[PDB]
Amino acid sequence: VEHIPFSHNHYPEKEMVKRSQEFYELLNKRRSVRFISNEQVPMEVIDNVIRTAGTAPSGAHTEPWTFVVVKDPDVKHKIRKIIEEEEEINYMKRMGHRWVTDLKKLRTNWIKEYLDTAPILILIFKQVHGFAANGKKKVHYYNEISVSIACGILLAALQNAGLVTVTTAPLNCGPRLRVLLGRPAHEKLLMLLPVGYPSKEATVPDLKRKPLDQIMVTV
């Protein structure tokens, strides 16, 4: 592959400052929403936020991500059963006292109503390796990180398109969900995001973010 000049949209410092400020205020309104209405949402928006996630950087340009989108309530209902069953055992046995306590402030449990109500579920699978065209294996360097970075971009894009979600990690649900969705073995489930509009009645926990001087260190 050949290398080409990079061209760059410049801004005056004054407009950089302003774009950076608006975008802070925009993403700072983002909250994880666990109560999602059944109102349908336009698929062109979903298509576009996925395509935005696909602009992410990736280790050695491997693009190791598969975004699986479910609209079908029958499929969504099987997903729900799998996750509620597995999470009930997670909460009652596998997570441990300390994790369960650390979650009290969030009021989460194994009941995940959003898996039926939300019109869209996005299941983000990482590809632990890939395949060349001749069927031999290719290495996916830093695949989990690459996929999580694209997930961060996806979240930004959703916030900026006026949709809500909550990033979830359905512990011990990977295999059953992979099989149910007909995905191949080199894909593993990394996170699941219900997507739509908030419910009229949606709450969030009243959490504060750290001030800049507790996350940023200069030298």
Added chain:
Amino acid sequence: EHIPFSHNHYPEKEMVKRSQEFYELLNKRRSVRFISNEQVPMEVIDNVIRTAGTAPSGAHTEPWTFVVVKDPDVKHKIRKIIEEEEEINYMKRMGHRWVTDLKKLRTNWIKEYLDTAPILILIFKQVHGFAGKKKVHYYNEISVSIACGILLAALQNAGLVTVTTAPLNCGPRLRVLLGRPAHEKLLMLLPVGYPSKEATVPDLKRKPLDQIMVT
């Protein structure tokens, strides 16, 4: 304590338009390995980090430390560290496959951007925290990485460039050098600023939507 969630809603047509234009802005983002020494406004840097800090995180743990280096001398020390360790990585440690897999990008162990970039951002994950005792940081690496994604969109939005790097085997030396505690581990390093006038990128193509999305 739990409160009502106040959303900011767009009509379908503004949803489509905002999402389309945000795709277009982010699809112009490229990893840039040649960075000008022209200084950049620290108010932007503060803002983009602030933005990264809005990321979700496992059990609301916020396990990230963003270490921003502007000082020439420390930066030259970071460069010496990374060049030494990447030399051994390319010669010995990565293996032939991995080195062959990087030919298209034309990377080696010389990392000039570590001196010329006005700003380095080093991202440390906190693999646990402290209350007296230690706190569990659930999904810390994934949380931090999600924060770095948000940071990259923010940088792209604010007119700056960077490249996401993972300086293999350099974490311990950089940690100690920069005064960070033993519960922080280096996850990645982003040199930040304007691209050099002569900057190039490799002529890579992204997958079409139907090769990354299954319905």
